Design a protein around this motif. Structure first.
Motif, PDB file in Angstrom:
ATOM      1  N   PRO A 306     -66.010  57.719   7.796  1.00 50.60           N
ATOM      2  CA  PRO A 306     -67.082  58.568   8.303  1.00 50.60           C
ATOM      3  C   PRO A 306     -66.932  58.758   9.800  1.00 50.60           C
ATOM      4  O   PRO A 306     -66.408  57.895  10.507  1.00 50.60           O
ATOM      5  CB  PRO A 306     -68.345  57.782   7.951  1.00 50.60           C
ATOM      6  CG  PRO A 306     -67.908  56.366   8.043  1.00 50.60           C
ATOM      7  CD  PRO A 306     -66.441  56.318   7.669  1.00 50.60           C
ATOM      8  N   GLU A 307     -67.388  59.914  10.275  1.00 53.68           N
ATOM      9  CA  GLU A 307     -67.413  60.209  11.700  1.00 53.68           C
ATOM     10  C   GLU A 307     -66.043  60.036  12.333  1.00 53.68           C
ATOM     11  O   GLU A 307     -65.849  59.140  13.158  1.00 53.68           O
ATOM     12  CB  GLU A 307     -68.426  59.314  12.414  1.00 53.68           C
ATOM     13  CG  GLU A 307     -69.764  59.217  11.709  1.00 53.68           C
ATOM     14  CD  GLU A 307     -69.876  57.978  10.845  1.00 53.68           C
ATOM     15  OE1 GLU A 307     -69.055  57.053  11.018  1.00 53.68           O
ATOM     16  OE2 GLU A 307     -70.779  57.931   9.984  1.00 53.68           O
ATOM     17  N   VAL A 308     -65.081  60.867  11.952  1.00 53.76           N
ATOM     18  CA  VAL A 308     -63.769  60.772  12.570  1.00 53.76           C
ATOM     19  C   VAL A 308     -63.574  61.816  13.660  1.00 53.76           C
ATOM     20  O   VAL A 308     -62.646  61.693  14.463  1.00 53.76           O
ATOM     21  CB  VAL A 308     -62.669  60.889  11.513  1.00 53.76           C
ATOM     22  CG1 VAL A 308     -62.871  59.837  10.457  1.00 53.76           C
ATOM     23  CG2 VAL A 308     -62.674  62.281  10.920  1.00 53.76           C
ATOM     24  N   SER A 309     -64.437  62.833  13.712  1.00 53.30           N
ATOM     25  CA  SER A 309     -64.378  63.866  14.748  1.00 53.30           C
ATOM     26  C   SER A 309     -62.967  64.416  14.915  1.00 53.30           C
ATOM     27  O   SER A 309     -62.489  64.592  16.038  1.00 53.30           O
ATOM     28  CB  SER A 309     -64.907  63.335  16.082  1.00 53.30           C
ATOM     29  OG  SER A 309     -64.792  64.311  17.102  1.00 53.30           O
ATOM     30  N   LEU A 310     -62.288  64.665  13.796  1.00 54.27           N
ATOM     31  CA  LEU A 310     -60.884  65.055  13.821  1.00 54.27           C
ATOM     32  C   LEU A 310     -60.667  66.261  14.722  1.00 54.27           C
ATOM     33  O   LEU A 310     -61.461  67.206  14.721  1.00 54.27           O
ATOM     34  CB  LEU A 310     -60.401  65.362  12.404  1.00 54.27           C
ATOM     35  CG  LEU A 310     -58.898  65.584  12.245  1.00 54.27           C
ATOM     36  CD1 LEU A 310     -58.124  64.557  13.027  1.00 54.27           C
ATOM     37  CD2 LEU A 310     -58.502  65.529  10.787  1.00 54.27           C
ATOM     38  N   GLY A 311     -59.586  66.220  15.491  1.00 51.66           N
ATOM     39  CA  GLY A 311     -59.340  67.195  16.527  1.00 51.66           C
ATOM     40  C   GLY A 311     -58.939  68.553  15.983  1.00 51.66           C
ATOM     41  O   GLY A 311     -58.334  68.697  14.921  1.00 51.66           O
ATOM     42  N   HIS A 312     -59.297  69.575  16.754  1.00 49.96           N
ATOM     43  CA  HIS A 312     -58.981  70.944  16.383  1.00 49.96           C
ATOM     44  C   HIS A 312     -57.486  71.122  16.168  1.00 49.96           C
ATOM     45  O   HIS A 312     -56.669  70.727  17.001  1.00 49.96           O
ATOM     46  CB  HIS A 312     -59.458  71.913  17.458  1.00 49.96           C
ATOM     47  CG  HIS A 312     -58.949  73.303  17.270  1.00 49.96           C
ATOM     48  ND1 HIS A 312     -57.715  73.710  17.727  1.00 49.96           N
ATOM     49  CD2 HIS A 312     -59.493  74.374  16.648  1.00 49.96           C
ATOM     50  CE1 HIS A 312     -57.527  74.977  17.407  1.00 49.96           C
ATOM     51  NE2 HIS A 312     -58.592  75.405  16.753  1.00 49.96           N
ATOM     52  N   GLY A 313     -57.131  71.720  15.036  1.00 55.90           N
ATOM     53  CA  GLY A 313     -55.747  72.044  14.760  1.00 55.90           C
ATOM     54  C   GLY A 313     -54.866  70.831  14.566  1.00 55.90           C
ATOM     55  O   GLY A 313     -53.642  70.950  14.483  1.00 55.90           O
ATOM     56  N   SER A 314     -55.475  69.654  14.491  1.00 51.69           N
ATOM     57  CA  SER A 314     -54.709  68.451  14.222  1.00 51.69           C
ATOM     58  C   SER A 314     -54.300  68.424  12.759  1.00 51.69           C
ATOM     59  O   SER A 314     -55.088  68.028  11.900  1.00 51.69           O
ATOM     60  CB  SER A 314     -55.523  67.211  14.573  1.00 51.69           C
ATOM     61  OG  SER A 314     -56.843  67.333  14.086  1.00 51.69           O
ATOM     62  N   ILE A 315     -53.090  68.888  12.460  1.00 49.09           N
ATOM     63  CA  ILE A 315     -52.601  68.818  11.094  1.00 49.09           C
ATOM     64  C   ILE A 315     -52.408  67.361  10.687  1.00 49.09           C
ATOM     65  O   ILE A 315     -52.096  66.490  11.503  1.00 49.09           O
ATOM     66  CB  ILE A 315     -51.297  69.617  10.951  1.00 49.09           C
ATOM     67  CG1 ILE A 315     -51.483  71.031  11.494  1.00 49.09           C
ATOM     68  CG2 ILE A 315     -50.860  69.691   9.502  1.00 49.09           C
ATOM     69  CD1 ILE A 315     -50.944  71.229  12.890  1.00 49.09           C
ATOM     70  N   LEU A 316     -52.605  67.094   9.399  1.00 52.10           N
ATOM     71  CA  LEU A 316     -52.381  65.773   8.831  1.00 52.10           C
ATOM     72  C   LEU A 316     -51.883  65.952   7.409  1.00 52.10           C
ATOM     73  O   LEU A 316     -52.695  66.122   6.499  1.00 52.10           O
ATOM     74  CB  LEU A 316     -53.668  64.943   8.815  1.00 52.10           C
ATOM     75  CG  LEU A 316     -54.246  64.249  10.046  1.00 52.10           C
ATOM     76  CD1 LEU A 316     -54.883  65.205  11.005  1.00 52.10           C
ATOM     77  CD2 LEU A 316     -55.289  63.275   9.593  1.00 52.10           C
ATOM     78  N   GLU A 317     -50.565  65.907   7.202  1.00 48.16           N
ATOM     79  CA  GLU A 317     -50.022  66.268   5.902  1.00 48.16           C
ATOM     80  C   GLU A 317     -50.381  65.320   4.769  1.00 48.16           C
ATOM     81  O   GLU A 317     -50.792  65.806   3.714  1.00 48.16           O
ATOM     82  CB  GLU A 317     -48.495  66.413   5.951  1.00 48.16           C
ATOM     83  CG  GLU A 317     -47.785  65.345   6.714  1.00 48.16           C
ATOM     84  CD  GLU A 317     -47.333  65.861   8.048  1.00 48.16           C
ATOM     85  OE1 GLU A 317     -47.869  66.904   8.465  1.00 48.16           O
ATOM     86  OE2 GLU A 317     -46.451  65.240   8.675  1.00 48.16           O
ATOM     87  N   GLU A 318     -50.271  64.004   4.940  1.00 49.01           N
ATOM     88  CA  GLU A 318     -50.634  63.169   3.803  1.00 49.01           C
ATOM     89  C   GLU A 318     -50.764  61.713   4.205  1.00 49.01           C
ATOM     90  O   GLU A 318     -50.183  61.279   5.198  1.00 49.01           O
ATOM     91  CB  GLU A 318     -49.611  63.280   2.671  1.00 49.01           C
ATOM     92  CG  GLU A 318     -48.248  62.767   3.016  1.00 49.01           C
ATOM     93  CD  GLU A 318     -47.311  62.843   1.835  1.00 49.01           C
ATOM     94  OE1 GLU A 318     -47.764  63.272   0.757  1.00 49.01           O
ATOM     95  OE2 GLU A 318     -46.124  62.487   1.981  1.00 49.01           O
ATOM     96  N   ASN A 319     -51.531  60.974   3.406  1.00 43.92           N
ATOM     97  CA  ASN A 319     -51.586  59.519   3.448  1.00 43.92           C
ATOM     98  C   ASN A 319     -51.978  59.007   4.829  1.00 43.92           C
ATOM     99  O   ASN A 319     -51.242  58.278   5.481  1.00 43.92           O
ATOM    100  CB  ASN A 319     -50.249  58.932   3.006  1.00 43.92           C
ATOM    101  CG  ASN A 319     -49.955  59.209   1.568  1.00 43.92           C
ATOM    102  OD1 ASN A 319     -50.289  58.414   0.699  1.00 43.92           O
ATOM    103  ND2 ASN A 319     -49.328  60.342   1.301  1.00 43.92           N
ATOM    104  N   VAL A 320     -53.165  59.391   5.265  1.00 45.70           N
ATOM    105  CA  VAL A 320     -53.642  59.074   6.603  1.00 45.70           C
ATOM    106  C   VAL A 320     -55.022  58.437   6.472  1.00 45.70           C
ATOM    107  O   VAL A 320     -56.044  59.123   6.403  1.00 45.70           O
ATOM    108  CB  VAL A 320     -53.663  60.299   7.513  1.00 45.70           C
ATOM    109  CG1 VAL A 320     -54.276  61.461   6.792  1.00 45.70           C
ATOM    110  CG2 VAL A 320     -54.437  59.991   8.760  1.00 45.70           C
ATOM    111  N   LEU A 321     -55.061  57.110   6.435  1.00 42.53           N
ATOM    112  CA  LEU A 321     -56.336  56.398   6.384  1.00 42.53           C
ATOM    113  C   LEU A 321     -56.933  56.394   7.784  1.00 42.53           C
ATOM    114  O   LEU A 321     -56.919  55.394   8.503  1.00 42.53           O
ATOM    115  CB  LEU A 321     -56.164  54.984   5.851  1.00 42.53           C
ATOM    116  CG  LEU A 321     -57.423  54.334   5.265  1.00 42.53           C
ATOM    117  CD1 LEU A 321     -57.069  53.089   4.499  1.00 42.53           C
ATOM    118  CD2 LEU A 321     -58.498  54.011   6.291  1.00 42.53           C
TER     119      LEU A 321
END
Lengths: 321, 291
Positions: A306-321
């Motif tokens: 919860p509440e990760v505030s993921l950054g704009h345009g930050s791609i994350l293809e897979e398996n990212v805890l």
């Protein structure tokens, strides 16, 4: 009878140096969770409820964290006894110690520190039971193992296993590691024992989920010279002239039990448990009700607390805890 | 008290508040008239409000205002009036009216925190006009710290999309103003289309500004799921079957419509402060609620 499980939370492959400085080995955060937790959830899954953990080096931090365990709640099904003994540094002494206090009633399942598993022992547990009490103690140990293929990153450069076994009762015939052995050595002891087929395998994992029997505490007390399980098994495999009462091996096919040892093993097992390879166990199931491990599983194996505030345009293809 | 001040009062209300959709401004001025009706009757007031709503419809060509008038007329006689003096009636009546005001104000916030959990993160949202409700529900979904883009059309006759962009980018969201005629192009690359509505028909489809339908049809052929938002009162008892059927009291203000209709075959999920819907459910709900 109840199903009680000895357990030591200091695997003496003391390799996670210097990492072992700050917090002990077992407590390690693999996926923001204690490995020892994974182990305990396992123990509960196969349905054992009186687990005897053990930690000598750095037992302090162990209790510090495990007081709030998934199984240190009063509602728990598992009872735990962190016997804060700092004398042994080889499992031999702790096995002679569970001898020294008659803790294990009978038919226990000893387990190293941080096995990652989902295995239902009950199939094994019962076949062990069968060929131990329809055979009256001729067994001492019924190794459990998990089929694999050598090339996988489960067997790092360090550790593999190769084993001769029988095929009728699946009893162990020899156990040995292969740290750089372009050939191997098996005695005809195998066949002068019996002329009805023998099998060699190199496709079992270092599952380290040995089922055993308190007469294993016997076999350790009666001879004060063993310091690891491999000591045990090879000593008993050579001492077959008399009073061996050999190991009854058994392999599974659908599960995943790995006794994480080295940083490469931690690497492999973490980035395979994120891939749900062990499921039930994965942090979006938040199996430890511990609050902040609310993991909102999402698209394409992207996990997200919860509440990760993921950054704009930050791609994350897979398996990212 | 006469009809002059009524219409000019609606005008003033909408002028001091372009942020208040025409319908609610109408209903407000309507309550205002009901206050200073200076009448003492029951039906003699029904006639007054009917005539006044006729005038308001004849001033502003939106479905919203006349529909709200219908619904207000309904929701002044909803249960037993407890007819006692034809005066205390007015008191309890206008009380229920101000309660109606309450729900109409709540409508947006209700529909926003009802919908802003419908937008999967990292997809392109393709609105169609200066849909106050669409802007609000987006604003919400952003406030929940999500990521997604915005394609807006421009609904040629009057610049709507330009205005929606100029007011949305104020929230710092990725915005891109397509040329409404180009909908068929960006229709490949946005997943789902939220579109503001200006009146729901009694079989589930919606009525909305010029381009809606064609966008609609595109956004069905490519299976791209298709959303819509509209609060309660914009339900209407108008059941066209062909785009020519929509009444002409709406279609104006050389010859070019301003609003048009989409069959409920296409609309895949409503959004009503009454809750999530399913166009046939808009029917059922309309027959029930309207009364």
């Amino acid at each position: 009878p109840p199903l009680q499980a000895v357990l030591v939370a200091d695997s003496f492959d003391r390799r996670f140096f210097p990492i072992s400085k700050d917090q002990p080995r077992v407590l390690l955060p693999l996926a923001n969770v204690a490995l020892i937790d994974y182990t305990l959830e396992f123990l509960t899954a196969t349905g054992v409820q009186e687990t005897f953990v053990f930690c000598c080096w750095k037992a302090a931090q162990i209790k510090e964290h495990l007081l709030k365990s998934k199984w240190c709640r009063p509602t728990s099904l598992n009872v735990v006894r962190i016997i804060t003994s700092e004398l042994y540094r080889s499992l031999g002494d702790v096995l002679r110690d569970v001898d020294a206090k008659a803790l294990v009633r009978s038919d226990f399942l000893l387990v190293y520190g941080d096995v990652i598993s989902n295995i239902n022992i009950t199939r094994a547990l019962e076949e062990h039971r069968l060929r131990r009490k329809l055979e009256k103690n001729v067994s001492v140990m019924t190794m459990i193992f998990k089929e694999s293929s050598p090339s996988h990153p489960t067997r790092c450069h360090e550790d593999n296993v190769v084993v001769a076994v029988d095929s009728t009762t699946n009893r162990v015939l020899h156990f040995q590691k292969t740290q750089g052995l372009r050939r191997f050595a098996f005695p005809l002891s195998l066949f002068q024992g019996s002329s009805d087929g023998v099998e060699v395998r190199y496709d079992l994992l270092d599952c380290h989920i040995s089922i055993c029997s308190p007469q294993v505490a016997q076999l350790f007390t009666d001879n004060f010279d063993y310091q690891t399980r491999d000591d045990f098994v090879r000593g008993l495999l050579v001492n077959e002239e008399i009073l061996g009462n050999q190991i009854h091996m058994h392999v599974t096919a659908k599960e995943y039990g790995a006794r994480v040892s080295n940083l490469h093993m931690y690497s492999a097992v973490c980035a395979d448990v994120i891939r749900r390879w062990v499921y039930p166990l994965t942090p979006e199931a938040n199996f430890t009700d511990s609050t902040t491990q609310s993991c909102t599983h999402s698209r394409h194996n992207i996990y997200r607390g919860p509440e990760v505030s993921l950054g704009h345009g930050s791609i994350l293809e897979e398996n990212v805890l | 008290m006469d009809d002059k001040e009524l219409i000019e009062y609606f005008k003033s209300q909408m002028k001091e508040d372009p942020d208040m959709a025409s319908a609610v401004a109408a209903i407000r001025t309507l309550l205002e008239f009901l206050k200073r009706d200076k009448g003492e009757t029951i039906q003699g007031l029904r006639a007054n409000l009917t005539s006044a709503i006729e005038t308001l419809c004849g001033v502003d060509s939106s479905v919203a205002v006349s529909s709200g008038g219908e619904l207000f007329l309904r929701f002044i006689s909803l249960a037993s009036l407890e007819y006692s003096d034809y005066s205390k009636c007015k008191k309890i009546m206008i009380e229920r009216g101000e309660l109606f005001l309450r729900r109409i104000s709540l409508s947006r916030n209700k529909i926003a925190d009802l919908c802003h959990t419908f937008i999967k993160d990292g997809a392109t949202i393709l609105t169609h006009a200066y849909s106050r409700v669409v802007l609000r529900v987006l604003e919400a979904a952003v406030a929940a710290k999500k990521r997604f883009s915005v394609y807006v059309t421009e609904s040629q006759p009057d610049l709507s999309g330009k205005k929606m962009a100029k007011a949305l980018c104020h929230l710092n969201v990725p915005v891109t103003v397509v040329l409404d005629a180009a909908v068929g192009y960006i229709m490949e690359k946005a997943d789902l289309v939220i579109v503001g509505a200006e009146g729901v028909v009694e079989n589930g489809g919606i009525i909305n500004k010029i381009g809606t339908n064609q966008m609609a049809v595109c956004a069905k052929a490519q299976n791209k799921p298709f959303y819509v938002v509209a609060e309660s009162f914009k339900f209407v008892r108008l059941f066209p079957l062909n785009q020519q059927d929509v009444p002409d009291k709406f279609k104006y203000k050389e010859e070019h419509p301003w609003v048009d209709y989409t069959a409920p075959s296409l609309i895949t999920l409503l959004f009503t402060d009454l809750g999530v819907l399913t166009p046939s459910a808009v029917s059922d709900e309309l027959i029930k609620l309207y009364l």
